[PDB]
C-alpha cells in the first residue's frame, strides 16, 4: 500500500514520450489516446493528492519545519496517509520541483491538465513555498541525508539545482495552453533565482559537506535538469564521478555505503558509529545509471559512448519467460566472499536481486530503459522530447532569457540607465547654479514615484483565495533588481528607488563615504547580475540635508563623475525620465482589477523619580538625557508618562535628534533602546554557512553561542538580545555594524578572509581596540563608541589586512590568534600526523584517541576539522595557540621529510 512520487512520475513521462513517438502515424488506431489519457489521469491524481493537504502548505509558507513539511508517501488505494512522519521525515523538495518541471513540459507540449482558476492559485502557492528552498536542509534523494544516517539533515546541491531549473522554466508561461489572456501567467521573483544560483555555484563542487561525491549528482547535471552551464566544471565533475564511482556492474551510489548489503540487518534504523568503516567494499550495485549515461551521450552526439555502454549493458540484462528485458534494482555479494572481495576489488561475482527473475519488477528501471532504447533507435528527435529547449548548444547561446546576455557568454559590457530627480526646488536651483542638472518631482506629473512598500503591499494583495484560505505572498523586502523595473498599477506608471535612499533610523546612512561605497556596490551588482531584455532603470534622489555645510564637496565630485560617464569602470547614461520611460517595455500588474556626561549610573540609580524628572527637564546634554531616560525605562517602564508624552515617544524623539546631530555614542545608545534590527542578517549568516565558515555571537570573555545551521530570525534576535541584556549596553549595534561590514567585505573581497573558520565578533573588536590603543601611544586611547562609520570601516580593513613587518611580532601574533588564523593545509598535515601517530596527541588536557577518528573519519570530511578546532580552541592565550600550530606545522614537515 506504499507509493513513491518519483517512480510514478517517471513512468508517466515515459508513457508521454511513447505517445509522442507514436503520434507520427495517422492510422494509429487511437493508440496515442490511452497513453495521453493515462498521463492526464496520473497527473490529475497527483494534483488531487497534493491539494488534499492544505493546512500543511500554509503552515510551511510561514514556519518551514519538518513538522509542517508536505507529506510525500500516502496510500495508493484511497490517497490517504498510512505512516507517521516520525519514521519517514516526509521532507523532500526535489519531487515537487520535478513535478512542476514536467507539468510545464507537457503543458508546453499541448496537453491539458488544469481546468479552473483554483489550480492556478495552488500553483502560485507552491511556487511561493518552493522559493525558500535554498536555506532549509533536506533529507536528500536517498532519504538518508548524512552518510552516518543518524537523523540529521544537510544541504543537497541536486535539490537546489532542480528548484532553480523549475523556477526558471515556470517564469512567464501561459498555463492554459492555446487560449489565455490575463489569468494564466506566473509571477517570479528574480532575487530567489539569483540566490539559488549563488548557492549552486558555491556548493556545486561538493554535493554536501559530509559527502565528497555521490551518484545522485547525475540527474541534476543530465537530461532531467540541464542546469550546469559551465562546460569545464561540468567536464571535471563528470570525470570525477566516473573515476570514483565506476563499477564492473554499473555505478554505485557513493563510497562507504552499506545499503541493503549482506552485513546489513533489519533491526537498527540508525547506523552505529564505526559501522560505516566495516560497511565499505560491499556496496550494492545499480545498473540503471548506464541508461542515464546513455541518455547524456546520445544528446551530446557521441555514438562511441552509446555503443560502449550498450555493449556493457547487454550481458547484465535479464529476460522474462517470453524474453522481455529486465533491469534489476541492486546487486549483492554472497556471504562467502565477505573478506575475499576486500583484498581484490571486483574479483568475485555478485548475485542478482529478488526482482531479477520473476514476480518482481522495478518500473522506474524499465521506463528509463524503454525511453533510452526509443531515443537510441532514432524513432524521434531531441527537439520533440524537449519542446522547451532546456538544453542548447554552444553556438545558439546568444539571446536566451534568464540564462545568458546578448553580448555573449564570455563578455560583460552592459550599459545601465540612471535617472536624476531632485526633491526640493531650492536644492534644484542650487545644483543648477553649479552646473548640475536635476528635476524636482513636480514637473514629472504623468509619471509617479512611489516608495518600496507600495510594491510589497501590492504583491501581498495577489494570490488570495477564499474557499481554501490563502495569505498570498509573504511581506518580504524587494531586492534592487526587482525595483529596477517599471510598473503599471491601475493604468498608472510606477517607479521606485532602491531601499538605500529611504530614511533609515540607523546612523551609518549619514556618512557620505558609506553611501558612495554602497551605491557603487549596488551598481556593480546590477551590472553583473542583470540578464533581462532592456537596459535597467536606476533612480537616485538627493536631499538638501545631505549637504550639511562642508560635507558638500564629495557629493559634487560624485555627481561630476556620474556626469562624465564612467564610474569605476562601469558605463552610465543620464537623461530626463520622460525619454527613458518612453519606448520601453513596462510590465503589467492587472490582478488588482480582477480582485563628558555629568550623570553616572551608580550615583543616580537611587535618586527618586521626581528628582530624575526635574534633572531631565533642566538638562541639555544628550548623554545625560539618554541615561536618565534609560534609568526611567528600567525602573518605571515604557508606559510611563513624561513631560514630552510617553517614554517611548520621548526616546524616539531624542534618538532622532541625536541622529540629526550625528553623536555616534548617543545614536548607538538610542538604537540599543529602540529594540531594532537590520533586515539583512539572515542573508549574511546563510552565506557564511554555505561558504563553510562558522559564526559565533557573544561578548569577549563571556558566554558565546555557536551557530551551525540556519535559524529563523526570531530565535537569533531573542538569543542575541538576552545576551545583550546580560552583559553590556551598546554592543548590539556594534556587532550589527561589524557583521554587516564583514559580510560586505567577504562579498566583494572573499580572499581576504582566507584561512578563517570560526569568526568571532568579540575577539575581532577586542583586537581592534588593542590596535587602536597601540596607535594612540602616549595619548589616551580613543573610545570606540564615538568612532564614525568611515573610521571603523578603515580600521577594520587595516586590521583585516595580511599584515607585514615593522610592528612588534607579538602584536601580529595576538591579532592572528584572535582571528583564529590557520595555515593553509594545516588540517591535512594534522591528519597525516595522526595516521603516523600510534598513540595520539594530547594538548591542554584534551585527548584525541586514534582508533575512533580513524574508524569514523576520512581525509577531507569536515567533522574532523570541527573536532580538531574544538580541541585546539581550549588554549587561552591566542599567541600561545599560534605557537602551538607553528610547532605542529614544523613537526609535520620534519616527519614527512624523513620516514625512517
Amino acid at each position: 500500500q506504499k507509493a513513491k512520487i518519483q517512480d510514478s512520475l517517471y513512468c508517466a513521462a515515459g508513457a508521454w514520450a511513447l505517445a509522442l513517438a507514436y503520434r507520427r502515424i495517422d492510422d494509429d488506431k487511437g493508440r496515442t489516446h490511452e497513453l495521453e489519457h493515462s498521463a492526464i489521469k496520473c497527473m490529475r491524481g497527483i494534483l488531487y493528492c497534493y491539494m488534499r493537504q492544505a493546512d500543511k502548505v500554509q503552515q510551511f509558507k510561514q514556519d518551514p519545519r519538518p513538522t509542517t513539511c508536505l507529506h510525500s508517501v500516502f496510500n495508493v488505494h484511497t490517497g490517504d496517509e498510512l505512516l507517521s512522519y516520525e519514521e519517514y521525515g516526509h521532507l523532500q523538495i526535489n519531487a515537487v520541483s520535478l513535478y512542476l518541471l514536467y507539468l510545464v513540459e507537457m503543458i508546453s507540449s499541448g496537453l491539458q491538465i488544469i481546468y479552473n482558476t483554483d489550480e492556478v492559485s495552488f500553483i502560485q502557492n507552491l511556487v511561493f513555498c518552493v522559493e525558500r528552498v535554498y536555506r532549509v536542509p533536506d533529507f536528500g534523494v536517498w532519504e538518508r541525508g548524512s552518510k552516518y544516517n543518524n537523523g540529521s539533515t544537510e544541504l543537497h546541491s541536486s535539490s537546489v539545482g532542480l528548484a532553480k531549473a523549475a523556477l526558471e522554466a515556470i517564469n512567464g508561461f501561459n498555463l492554459f495552453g492555446n487560449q489565455g489572456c490575463s489569468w494564466s501567467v506566473i509571477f517570479v521573483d528574480l532575487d530567489a533565482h539569483n540566490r539559488n544560483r549563488q548557492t549552486l555555484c558555491s556548493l556545486l563542487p561538493r554535493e554536501s559537506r559530509s559527502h565528497n561525491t555521490d551518484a545522485a549528482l547525475l540527474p541534476c547535471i543530465s537530461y532531467p535538469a540541464f542546469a550546469l552551464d559551465d562546460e569545464v566544471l561540468f567536464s571535471q565533475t563528470l570525470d570525477k564521478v566516473v573515476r570514483k564511482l565506476k563499477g564492473k556492474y554499473g555505478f554505485k551510489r557513493f563510497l562507504r555505503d552499506g545499503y541493503r548489503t549482506s552485513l546489513e540487518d533489519p533491526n537498527r534504523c540508525y547506523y552505529k558509529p564505526a559501522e560505516i568503516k566495516l560497511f565499505d567494499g560491499i556496496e550494492c550495485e545499480f545498473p540503471i545509471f548506464f541508461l542515464y549515461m546513455m541518455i547524456d551521450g546520445v544528446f551530446r552526439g557521441n555514438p562511441k559512448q552509446v555503443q560502449e555502454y550498450q555493449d556493457l549493458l547487454t550481458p547484465v540484462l535479464h529476460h522474462t519467460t517470453e524474453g522481455y528485458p529486465v533491469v534489476p534494482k541492486y546487486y549483492y555479494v554472497p556471504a562467502d566472499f565477505v573478506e575475499y572481495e576486500k583484498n581484490n576489488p571486483g574479483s568475485q561475482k555478485r548475485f542478482p536481486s529478488n526482482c531479477g527473475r520473476d514476480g518482481k519488477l522495478f518500473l522506474w528501471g524499465q521506463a528509463l530503459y524503454i525511453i533510452a532504447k526509443l531515443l537510441a533507435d532514432e524513432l524521434i528527435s531531441p527537439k520533440d522530447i524537449d519542446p522547451v529547449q532546456r538544453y542548447v548548444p554552444l553556438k545558439d547561446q546568444r539571446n536566451v532569457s534568464m540564462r545568458f546576455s546578448n553580448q555573449g557568454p564570455l563578455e560583460n559590457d552592459l550599459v545601465v540607465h540612471v535617472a536624476l530627480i531632485a526633491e526640493s526646488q531650492r536644492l534644484q536651483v542650487f545644483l543648477n547654479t553649479y552646473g548640475i542638472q536635476t528635476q524636482t518631482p513636480q514637473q514629472v506629473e504623468p509619471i509617479q514615484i512611489w516608495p518600496q512598500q507600495e510594491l510589497v503591499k501590492a504583491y501581498l494583495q495577489l494570490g488570495i483565495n477564499e474557499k481554501l484560505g490563502l495569505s498570498g505572498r509573504p511581506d518580504r523586502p524587494i531586492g534592487c533588481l526587482g525595483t529596477s523595473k517599471i510598473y503599471r498599477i491601475l493604468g498608472k506608471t510606477v517607479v521606485c528607488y532602491p531601499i538605500i535612499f529611504d530614511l533609515s533610523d540607523f546612523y551609518m546612512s549619514q556618512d557620505v563615504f558609506l553611501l558612495i561605497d554602497d551605491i557603487k556596490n549596488a551598481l556593480q551588482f546590477i551590472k553583473q547580475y542583470w540578464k533581462m531584455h532592456g537596459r535597467p532603470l536606476f533612480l537616485v534622489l538627493i536631499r538638501e540635508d545631505n549637504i550639511r555645510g562642508s560635507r558638500f564637496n564629495p557629493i559634487l565630485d560624485m555627481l561630476a563623475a556620474l556626469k562624465k560617464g564612467i564610474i569605476g569602470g562601469v558605463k552610465v547614461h543620464v537623461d530626463r525620465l520622460q525619454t527613458l520611460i518612453s519606448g520601453a517595455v513596462v510590465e503589467q500588474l492587472d490582478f488588482l482589477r480582477i480582485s563628558q556626561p555629568d550623570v553616572n549610573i551608580s550615583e543616580w540609580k537611587d535618586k527618586p523619580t521626581h528628582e530624575i524628572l526635574q534633572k531631565l527637564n533642566d538638562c541639555s546634554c544628550l548623554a545625560s538625557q539618554a541615561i536618565l531616560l534609560g534609568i526611567l525605562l528600567k525602573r518605571e517602564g515604557p508606559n510611563f508618562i513624561t513631560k514630552e508624552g510617553t517614554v517611548s515617544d520621548h526616546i524616539e524623539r531624542v534618538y532622532r535628534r541625536a541622529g540629526s546631530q550625528k553623536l555616534w555614542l548617543a545614536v548607538r545608545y538610542g538604537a540599543a533602546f529602540t529594540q531594532k534590527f537590520s533586515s539583512s542578517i539572515a542573508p549574511h549568516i546563510t552565506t557564511f554557512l554555505v561558504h563553510g565558515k562558522q559564526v559565533t555571537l557573544g561578548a569577549f570573555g563571556h558566554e558565546e553561542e555557536v551557530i551551525s545551521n540556519p535559524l529563523s530570525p526570531r530565535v537569533i534576535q531573542n538569543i542575541i538580545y538576552y545576551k545583550c541584556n546580560t552583559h553590556d549596553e551598546r554592543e548590539a549595534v556594534i556587532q550589527q555594524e561589524l557583521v554587516i561590514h564583514i559580510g560586505w567585505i567577504i562579498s566583494n573581497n572573499p580572499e581576504l578572509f582566507s584561512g578563517m573558520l570560526k569568526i568571532r565578533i568579540g575577539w575581532i573588536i577586542h583586537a581592534m581596540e588593542y590596535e587602536l590603543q597601540i596607535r594612540g601611544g602616549d595619548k589616551p586611547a580613543l573610545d570606540l563608541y564615538q568612532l564614525s562609520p568611515s573610521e571603523v570601516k578603515q580600521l577594520l580593513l587595516d586590521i583585516l589586512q595580511p599584515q607585514q613587518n615593522g610592528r612588534c611580532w607579538l602584536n601580529r601574533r595576538q591579532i592572528d590568534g584572535s582571528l583564529n588564523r590557520t595555515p593553509t593545509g594545516f588540517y591535512d598535515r594534522v591528519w597525516q600526523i595522526l595516521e603516523r601517530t600510534p598513540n595520539g596527541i594530547i594538548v591542554a588536557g584534551k585527548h584525541l584517541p586514534q582508533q575512533p577518528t580513524l574508524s569514523d573519519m576520512t581525509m577531507y570530511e569536515m567533522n574532523f576539522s570541527l573536532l580538531v578546532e574544538d580541541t585546539l580552541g581550549n588554549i587561552d592565550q591566542p599567541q600561545y595557540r599560534q605557537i602551538v600550530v607553528e610547532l605542529l606545522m614544523v613537526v609535520s614537515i620534519v616527519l614527512e621529510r624523513n620516514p625512517e
Binding site: 488506431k29 487511437g30 492526464i40 491539494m51 488534499r52 481546468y115 479552473n116 492554459f176
Partner: protein, 995 residues
Amino acid sequence: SNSGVRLDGYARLVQQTILCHQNPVTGLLPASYDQKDAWVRDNVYSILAVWGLGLAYRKNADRDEDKAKAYELEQSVVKLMRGLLHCMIRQVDKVESFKYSQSTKDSLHAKYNTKTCATVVGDDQWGHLQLDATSVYLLFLAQMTASGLHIIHSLDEVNFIQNLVFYIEAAYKTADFGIWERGDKTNQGISELNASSVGMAKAALEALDELDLFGVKGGPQSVIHVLADEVQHCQSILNSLLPRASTSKEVDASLLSVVSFPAFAVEDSQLVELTKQEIITKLQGRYGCCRFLRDGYKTPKEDPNRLYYEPAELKLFENIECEWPLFWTYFILDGVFSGNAEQVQEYKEALEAVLIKGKNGVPLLPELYSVPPDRVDEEYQNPHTVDRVPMGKLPHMWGQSLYILGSLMAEGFLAPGEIDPLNRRFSTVPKPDVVVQVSILAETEEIKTILKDKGIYVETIAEVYPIRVQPARILSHIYSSLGCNNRMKLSGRPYRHMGVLGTSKLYDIRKTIFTFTPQFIDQQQFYLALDNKMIVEMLRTDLSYLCSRWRMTGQPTITFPISHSMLDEDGTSLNSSILAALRKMQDGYFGGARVQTGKLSEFLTTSCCTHLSFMDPGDFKALVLQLKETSSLQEQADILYMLYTMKGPDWNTELYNERSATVRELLTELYGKVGEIRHWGLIRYISGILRKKVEALDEACTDLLSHQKHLTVGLPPEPREKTISAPLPYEALTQLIDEASEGDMSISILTQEIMVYLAMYMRTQPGLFAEMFRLRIGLIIQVMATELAHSLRCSAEEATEGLMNLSPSAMKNLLHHILSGKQGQWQRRRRLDGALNRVPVGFYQKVWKVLQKCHGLSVEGFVLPSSTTREMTPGEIKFSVHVESVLNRVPQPEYRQLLVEAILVLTMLADIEIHSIGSIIAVEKIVHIANDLFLQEQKTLGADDTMLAKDPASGICTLLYDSAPSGRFGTMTYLSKAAATYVQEFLPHSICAMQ
C-alpha cells in the same frame, strides 16, 4: 452588440446563482440549503444551463476572451462530470453484487458526500434505490460526449460503464422507491414499479447503442454494445401503463419529464395529448401544481417531527396540497421545444407573477407556497381560493437552471438541434413497414429429396461451408464475456435468455459468418415445441412481432431448419401443417407480414452485419435387476423415481458393467424413447423429476402483473394459498411455486403451462379478462377437471387421467373455451360464475354508493362497517379486496352468486326511495324471505312435493337455482319483493317513494 449584452447578463446571473457553490477539487455542488449533501439527480440537472451557455458562446466566440470563457465553462462541466463518475467508480463491489439477484441492500447509495467522497449514511437509514438518476446521468453523458467533450480517459472506465449498463438494463421488472424517495402513495415504503424510471432508462439505453466515448479518434474497442429486446420491453411496459404512473397512484406530475425535453420515449401522440390534458385539468392550481394527490409534505398537521404516517389520512391531506412550480417551468420549455409559441407566452406571463426578487434584483424560484394554518376550513369548501405563503428552502438550483435554459432557448441565441445532436425530436415520425427475409434448409439428403418432391428447392447444412449455424445458447455464452476485467473483479454480462431480435441479424466472428436459429425450436428445454400446430403459431406471432418494430437498419433474416421430428409417423413426408405453412410463406404473405424466400448467397449482400471485436485474441442390486428385466414405461418411471428419491440422486446404478450409468443419465435417455411414442402421460412425470423450468417466466409474470391483476399459486384453502402482488426473482418465484404445489410435482408444471398460455393470450386478445380481478390457477384446475368429468361422465380420477394425456393444443382450446364462457342446465352456468366470481363491471362503485346510505352490510356475523367509505375511494384496490374478502366467506359458489344478485337488487331499489335506512342489512335474511315466498307461491299453484325438493345442506329449493334470472317468474322479482319487505320492516311507517 445586443447579443453580447444579453450573454454577459446571462453569464453574470449563472455565476451569481449556481457557480458560486461549485466546490472545486471534488466538483460537487451542495444539494441546496444547509444540508451538506450532494444528490446525484440535482448535480446532473444543474449543469444544463452552463452547458447551453457555453455552446452559445462557442459558435459566436471569434475572440480570445470568448474562447477562454467557452473553454472554462467546458472545463467546469468536465470537472463536475468526473466528480460524479469518481464516487460510483469507488463502489464497484455494490454494482457487482447487484448484477446477480435484485435487492435494496446491494444497491448504490443515492446521497454522496462532500470532499473525500465518502459515505454519510448506512444501508438502513435511507432509500438507496433510484434507477432514474443513473439513467438520466448516462443520457446526459452520451449527449455531452456526442457534442465533443472528452469525459472518459482510461479504458477501465469503459468496462465500468459497460457493467453499469447491465446494472440498469433490468429496470422493466425491478421495483424502486421512486423519484420522490417515498415508496408508494403512503409511507412505510414498499418497493413498487413506476413508469418514470422505465421511461427514463429506455432512452438512456437507446442513446449508447454505438456512440463511442473516444470521439473521432477512437479504436476497434471504443463502443458500448447494447441489446434491443430490453428497449422493446420497456416501450411495451410504458405503453401499457402510460395513463397512470403506478398501480397505487392515479396520476403523477413527474410523467411530464418523460414526455418532454429530457429523454423523449413515447409514441402515439394522442396519448401524449390525453395525458397533458388530464394533468392540466386535474393538477393545475393557482400559483403552482402538485406532484400527486394526497401528499402531506410540509403541512400544518402531520406532526412533521414524525415519520411513518399512521393510517389516518381521512381528510387531513385533502385539497391542502401545497404547490410545485417545477412542473410549471417545465411547460414553457415543452411548448417552446417543437412548434408552440402562444402557450409559451401564456406560461411565461403566468410564472412571472409568482417570482420573488431577492438580493441584487435577480430571479429566484421558491420551492412551494404553504396554506396558512388558520384558513384551512375555507379551502375544504372553496378549493384553490385561499392565498398561500412561501415556506421552505428556496435556493432551488434545478428549477432556476431549467428556467434560465428555457429563457435562453426562447431568446433565439441557440437552436433546438444543438442541445440534442442525436436528433431525438423525430420519435413521432411513423415508419411504414419492413420486409422480412426467411431462409429454409434441410438437415439431411432425405429431407431435401422430400422437399424437392413437392417442388420446394432448398440446400443442406453442407455445400455452404463458409457459413455455419448453431443454437443461440452458444451465442448467449459468448455474450457472457463482454466487459470482463480481472483486476477490478468484474465478471461481465451474466447469462440470460436471448431474444429473437438478436438472432435475426448476421454476425462476424474472426472473419467468419455465423447464423443462429430461433430459441423456440429447442427441444432440450421443454416439450411444448414437439407440436407442429404450436410451432406454426409461434412462427406466426414471431414474424408479426419482428415485422412490427424492426427499429434497426437493414432487412431481417430468419433461419428455419426442418427437423426429423416434423416428419410424419412413417418418416417419408413432412406434416400437412408444415407444408401448408411453407406454401403460405411463399408468394409473399404469411400471418401478418410479407415474407420473401431465397438463399443465403443473395441475402448476404443486403443484410445487417455486426462486427465483434472482444473475442479477438489478447437390496438395491435386486431393484436394479428388476428394472433391467422389466418393461413398460409406467414401471420404468416408477422404479426410477423411487431410486432417485431414496438413494439415487447422483449415485451410479451400475446397470451397465462397462459404463457407469447414473440415474440422471437413465432419465435423460428415457426422453429419447418417450419422444417417438408421443405418450403425454409420463413425459410430464419425468420432467417434474428433473425439475425443468421454463425460460422467460419472470417476463410473462410481470406482464400479467402490469395489467392491474393479482396472481396466486396454491390450491385452497388458506394458508396454503399465497398472493404474488409484486414481481419476484426467478429463484424466489420457482421456490414459491414449489412450496405452493407441495409434493404433487405435476402441479408446478401445469401451473407454468397455464401461466404461459395466459401470457400469450393477454397480448393478442386483452378483452376476455374483463369482469375478473383475481386469477386463481388452482380454481381453474378444479373447474377444468370438473368440466371434463361432466363431459365424459366419468369419475374424478378418470377425468384427471384424461386431463394429463391431452395435447398442449387441447389445453389451448379448452382454456379458450372456458374463458369465452361458451334439471342441470342453469345450475352449471351458476356454478361456473361462482367458481370464477365474474362480478359485473360497475359492482364496486354501486356497492360504495349504497354503503354511503347505510351503516353496513352484514353477511353471517361478519360486518362491513360504513366508516370505510371515507377511509377509501372506489378506484383504490384495497376497497375491492376487502369487499371480495367479505363476499368470499361462504364456500358455496351458488351462495356467492345469489348474494351478488341480492345486493344488486338492493342497489337498484335504493335509488327509488330518498331516505336513510339507519340500520344494518342482512342479505341472507332477504334471500330466505324470497325463497319462502317462491315456495309458498309454488305450493299455492299446486305443484307436487317432489319438484319442491330441498338440498341436503342449503335450505333453498333447487328449482329456485334452476330459475332463469329475468321474466315474470324469475328469481329477481322474488329478491326485489323480499328486499322491499325488509326495507319496510325497518322504516318509519312511510316509504315516500318517487322517481
